[PDB]
Symmetry: C4
Subunit: 463 residues, 4 copies
């Protein structure tokens, strides 16, 4: 019959080694795979840190080089408030760019024609943007305005080894002023540490932003980096990873196929021998959830590794996507180590406890999600005008979530004690709102989560 | 008889659909109502954020424009300490107001006659207030004083496209100096984003406050906003909300009436058939608590929505009350989603667990409230002189409440280690006070809350 | 016999009202007493806040008036590092004192002869203190030194409606420089708010401290206040409190005596009727622990109230002791409200749960106190040189106690990541030290506290 | 037979005192030993604090004396950004060194020939280090470079009671600039407090670090201290400690030997009388784990104390190792006090509860360590570029560990809300990453730890 077949299936790997003495091949390939993807990620991260620090250190210098009166820590507050401050900040940036070779501590080269589209072959583009028609007159509430954006650009060229000073800003109708230029530098560390060619190109954008027309013009400096090569093992290790995961993917895929076949042969044997019905869940047991994790992580590592090879050779620069693919795959393979612990009864007791408590925990989350959401909306609408932590809905969730886990509680209460939301009614509401939310979720909801787990443990211990 | 009537009543909605096949009308109207009030609140909040940011950004600029030597972050500390500092801060504010057109980055218009009652048609009123008779002489402890407040006001008028410099302050008897004026601006974003007429009027009040007569005169700037129109779907959606909640209110009210009638017919059927007694609680079961929530939230949304329509058209400006009405209603409708989960046994187990634990939790709160209050009073009286967190009773409660939830613990201990309350006895007391309070409430009181919930869960699981 | 007597004793007050119909007199006097001592403390605290704020606001002004280059927030860091900085800071303080009338915003009077013992009738005493013999020579490690302190004082007198500039500091042997003077002011708020005579005298002490001889001389300013009267209900309420607590003390004392007598009559009735033995505990049951609390709090309120009357009339100024006496008494009377809840079975279940868990919790505290202490000593000795939070033993306990309650964890880890304790070995140790301590105490010790309480609850529920 | 022997063995000490009336000698020596090692550590720590504060206070002064424009709190940010700033910072340090006698508040002596190896008999060595061949040209990506480090040093000699101003820095190829010199001072406090000879020598190193070649040159000042003697009970107490621990080591070692012998005599008595098998664990019971702790701590105290004697006499200066040896020994002896509590049944219930829960807790830690590690790697790779808390793997673990214990949660969420990781995809990932991690570990993993302990308690209570 097949009971012998279905007996081998659904058996422990240790037992499987006594019947037919099949060598453990997936088990040893999984342990190899955990080691290579983990080392690959560590190598990726170590080199990515070096690039991040170089880009960040240079951007700090640009702020000190080009932003008038700039000090560390005043990035969100850095702003101009008068017409002359705005003029002085703009002229300082351009003035500092023109003497950059003789003042800067880094070796920055002018990138001819780096001012962007607005530049006519110039290396620095000083643009001001305003509406076609402002005609703003608060004196009699008259607002003849044509929202069409008119860009007025000035071309500045670097000295070989001043029209911009004649800049008039249309303050009443102004939208923003931008300074665009590029600077080329060489990452010296690379030429000594790994003898790697690394010519960075920095696209500096200094924005004097008046889109809010609120009398306050924030000033920020931003950089984009283009890493080229100034005119191995890592690649070999990357191919090794792709092979190890590709081999793992096939064997796991093969095992999954065997389950689907065995499931098919069973659905009819019971529908003939007994004519008995089989539900969709009854067939899930033929599905190995761990193997689903393994192939899912194989796909992420191969797909993530392919993009990483492009990044290493200077062709992709899609760090965000590659890092997420490799990070999530690495998380999955380490999680997959739980499967090995399920082969031991003492460890399986704990893992099984979480498995049987998980449906109750998920159900309780839906029950309390609606209470949580109601508080989020209530707090955002009421406390948003007054509380720095309730400004956006996503910020409200982060605040409330931290509160129920006992973090940042007093500062939340202190913010509402400072000016009281400029209202006794609002201050009184914040008291009921925060006291009831924290009391409910910590003393009752959190206590129920403990009970669900303890109940699951009790049943696993005492079947 | 009526057992058939009372059987339909107290039945699940799913069962109700088999008997008489009554369409679920309240159930579908509740789900519609959850969607419209939630979207209405989100729309209210998104637009309220835009107004709040514009008002806040302008107020920051006014502080930089009018407050001498002002820097961000020094709002609570901003103060003058000498006679010449006070003079320089006052003259700077008035001097900056008179050149505002040619220095400011925003477009601010002078509001003629905006100085308030003290102004005689002037746009800026510089007032100093002092007692009628000061005669303060600490040299021989003589205090001839007439507390009557004498307001001395100076009229300043803006330049068309200096008497204030001749200001003498009666320092010995001074109460405060205030500068009042108004500035009119137009929210440009509105004319481009939603083509909405929005002429703001800012009432700026700069206070040099000496009511404490402590040698330190704090300086603050405050603004009041009057949003008018410079010379739709939102309203249609608001009527839709009022109709949806009004329809929900009637049906829920009707259902509530049916319960009261059925309760009346039962009180006498059992008092005739059996002559048996019925207690007040026995009649509560005819009361649907969920329907009480529904009509309560209907009233809040309609009442809140009516005020919101006034705000949208520039007639009310009662944001605080409207936001609380809409916030609390929205919280209630999302909470009301719990009722739907009670129709499923697996979810009902969790909801029922909290319901049966709730009386024990409430009783334990009263038991521990008196211990908590005793600590609050003890800490305020003893540590109030020395600890920044124990200054007021409401502040003490916020500090202690955060402590028992494991927040801001070390800073509380650090404050008392800095100067030790300038007393070994006080420092020693703070140690016993804080160590005993945290140990008692975390290790015993909090552990009891867990036990009450676990006991409630045990009984629901094992009846 | 006496079983009727011992039956009335050990009965509930409600039952006591049916037998002999004795009016509840202590019960109503306790509720009255809770109300009067709580209101008395609130009145004490409200007025104490006003004095504290006035003293603090004046001290801030003195720092701005007399400390060269002083800014808020730099109190612990304020120091001089060169000989000329020290000279400039000293001369600034004296220079500012001599023009105080014409620059200050408060009304400060010179107190003739206020310079202290060092002053010879002068209002300001500028003292420098140095060793008799310094002869410090690090060039050849020679240290001829006579530790006798020689005080060199200079007398400065205020202008009627400069020898100090000729000051030479013996830097090599210097200990400190102090400036002593007094300033008299009148709390104007008092003469308007409560028409109360309040002439403050401020003893200002500015210390330039070189006792560490470390090249850094910290500078601090301190004030002592002497509140006199410049030339009611509160007192009546204070007598009411003393009477209410004195009446409560007698009745509780009387009840306690009745217990001791009844205990005596029982010890021999059982030693005659049965000749049976009675242990010391068996006689404790005749002791009413609540009455012990009541008389203990009566003594604190009367003793605390007596001192408060002296403070109110300007004769004591012992705020610390009075506040502790009134704070601790008030805590006790609110705690005593628990007794009333023990008369109700539902509430008594919770209170009894904590009572029966309390011995196990106390025993577990002794078990874990020795582990806790071992960590405190280990951390102080090892991490004290490197970590700002491990500088003193009391600071270490505050740090560790906050850690196990989930507070200030990341900053503790961050401090050791900054410079790594300037040692890999020390950094590695800090990792094991902190990870093992937090893991042990949160996951095991804290989990046991929950178990002890849950076990106590289980036995109370299921006897 | 031996059952009488094995009966004395494995008996309580109290019982042991009735059989043969053997005086408790180890028990009284352990209590003595706890007292002496604890007092020894406190004495070590108190004196070590004094040295640490003196070294730290002097280093702060050096920063104010030698670092141009230095202010407290700007140690990590202190940096130069232009060629002239770097020149001014270097010349200021050397200029301030040459006038140190007449400006400093401490008594610092020049150490002739203290400039280090680079110095040719000079007291201050100003060195600049650069590559042999820079030839950096970002204009056409040309990088002819010879990484050989060339040190160019300038000799500066102090005035007896300027070639450095002629310094040209090779900015394009520069690695760092260092200033080395030594200053000798005498700890005056020592000559007055303990009449102790203490001549400190400070090796000051000021580094202008350009190894990153990022346009930003951080500036830091570091000191090394050499404490000699300028030309008792503590030592006697140290010998007392060594004797007490040496005596304890022998007796504990003797007792351990008795167990091994008794184990040997038993292995064969049961293998003859019964011929029964004995497993390795069955023989562990003859091992007294407490005695293992005692001898282990004896070794640490003696070894730690020996090094401390060298430090006290000015010969070792290995504070880190000595402090760890004495700290860990002291922790062990206080932990060993648990053994005494195990002799009492009420206390033993608690200690035994933790002992029987410990294997389950350790197993659960391995189960959750792999999930924890997967999150650590995922977060470091993805959030490392964007989040200040995810920069290194050890930092990630500290962040995640604090999160699950409810600390620093909101700031972690806030950092990702600031710039959103400059990517919606990254921001969305951070939401799933943090919400799932905190929810999983707090609501499930932490709840299981409580269950394991409660289950262990239940079995101890109810065998
Ligand atoms: C195009 C697709 C072709 C795929 C063909 C793959 C065929 C193939 O090799 O499987 C046999 C073993 C796999 O070894 P391995 O995966 O370790 O062992 C298998 C598992 O034990 C599986 O149970 P679970 O995984 O627990 O559900 C069991 O049912 C399989 O069939 P059985 O019990 O009747 O024996 C075993 O063969 O092979 C190797 O040991 C690696 C050799 C390199 C494989 C890659 C060669 C390209
Ligand atoms: C001035 C006051 C007049 C109020 C008159 C209202 C009369 C009216 O319509 O109710 C019937 C249904 C309500 O539909 P709906 O509320 O969904 O259904 C009712 C509920 O099931 C109720 O039980 P619970 O709510 O669970 O306690 C049940 O006892 C009612 O009586 P029954 O079992 O004998 O049938 C049902 O009619 O109506 C509509 O489906 C919407 C039509 C628009 C209603 C607004 C018309 C203006
Ligand atoms: C110098 C010392 C003299 C002290 C003399 C005090 C004598 C005195 O009055 O007690 C009777 C009641 C007290 O009233 P009150 O304390 O409320 O009632 C007593 C308690 O119920 C007590 O039980 P517990 O407290 O529960 O242990 C009970 O054993 C006493 O004796 P009994 O059952 O045989 O009746 C009762 O008299 O009195 C007043 O109702 C206030 C009148 C003002 C008392 C102050 C007068 C100066
Ligand atoms: C070179 C090595 C020589 C080591 C020789 C040491 C021999 C020696 O003294 O032990 C006897 C007692 C120890 O006293 P003490 O350690 O308190 O008592 C022992 C313990 O009770 C031990 O049980 P546990 O520790 O519970 O496992 C027990 O089996 C021993 O043998 P017994 O039951 O047959 O009597 C007892 O003698 O001695 C002193 O009371 C201190 C005198 C100073 C010892 C240092 C002298 C240099
Ligand atoms: Na916390």
């Amino acid at each position: 019959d097949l009971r012998r077949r279905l007996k081998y299936f659904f058996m422990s790997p240790c037992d499987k080694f006594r019947a037919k003495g099949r060598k453990p091949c997936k088990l040893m390939l999984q342990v190899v795979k955990i080691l290579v993807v983990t080392v690959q990620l560590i190598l990726f991260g170590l080199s990515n840190q070096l690039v991040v620090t170089f880009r960040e250190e240079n951007t700090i210098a640009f702020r000190h080089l080009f932003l008038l009166g700039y000090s560390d820590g005043s990035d969100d507050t850095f702003a101009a408030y008068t017409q002359e401050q705005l003029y002085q900040a703009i002229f300082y940036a351009v003035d500092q760019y023109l003497i950059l070779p003789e003042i800067s501590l880094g070796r920055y080269a002018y990138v001819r024609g780096g001012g962007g589209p607005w530049a006519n072959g110039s290396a620095l583009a000083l643009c001001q943007r305003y509406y076609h028609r402002g005609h703003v007159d608060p004196a009699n509430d008259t607002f003849d305005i044509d929202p069409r954006v008119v860009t007025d650009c000035i071309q500045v060229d670097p000295p070989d080894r001043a029209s911009y000073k004649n800049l008039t800003l249309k303050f009443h109708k102004l939208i923003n002023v931008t300074i665009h230029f590029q600077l080329k530098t060489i990452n010296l560390q690379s030429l000594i540490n790994n003898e790697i060619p690394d010519c960075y190109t920095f696209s500096i954008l200094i924005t004097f932003d008046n889109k809010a027309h609120s009398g306050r013009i924030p000033i920020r400096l931003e950089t984009k980096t283009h890493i080229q090569e100034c005119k191995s093992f890592r690649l070999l290790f990357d191919v090794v990873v792709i092979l190890t995961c590709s081999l793992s993917f096939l064997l796991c895929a093969r095992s999954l196929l065997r389950g689907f076949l065995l499931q098919n042969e069973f659905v009819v044997f019971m529908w003939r021998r007994r004519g008995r019905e089989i539900s969709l869940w009854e067939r899930l047991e033929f599905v190995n959830g761990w193997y689903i994790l393994l192939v899912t992580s194989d796909v992420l590592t191969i797909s993530g590794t392919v993009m990483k090879i492009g990044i290493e050779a200077k062709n992709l620069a899609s760090y965000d996507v590659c890092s997420i693919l490799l990070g999530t795959s690495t998380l999955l393979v380490w999680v997959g180590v739980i499967r090995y612990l399920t082969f031991f009864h003492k460890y399986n007791i704990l893992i099984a406890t979480l498995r049987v408590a998980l449906p109750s925990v998920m159900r309780f989350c839906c029950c309390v999600a609606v209470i949580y959401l109601g508080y989020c909306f209530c707090g955002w609408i009421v406390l948003g005008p007054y509380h720095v932590k309730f400004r956006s809905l996503s910020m409200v969730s982060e605040c409330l979530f931290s509160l129920i886990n006992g973090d940042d509680m007093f500062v939340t209460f202190a913010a509402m004690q400072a000016q009281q939301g400029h209202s006794s009614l609002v201050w009184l509401f914040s008291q009921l709102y925060l006291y009831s939310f924290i009391s409910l979720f910590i003393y009752m909801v959190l206590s129920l989560f403990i009970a669900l787990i303890t109940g699951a443990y009790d049943t696993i211990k005492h079947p």
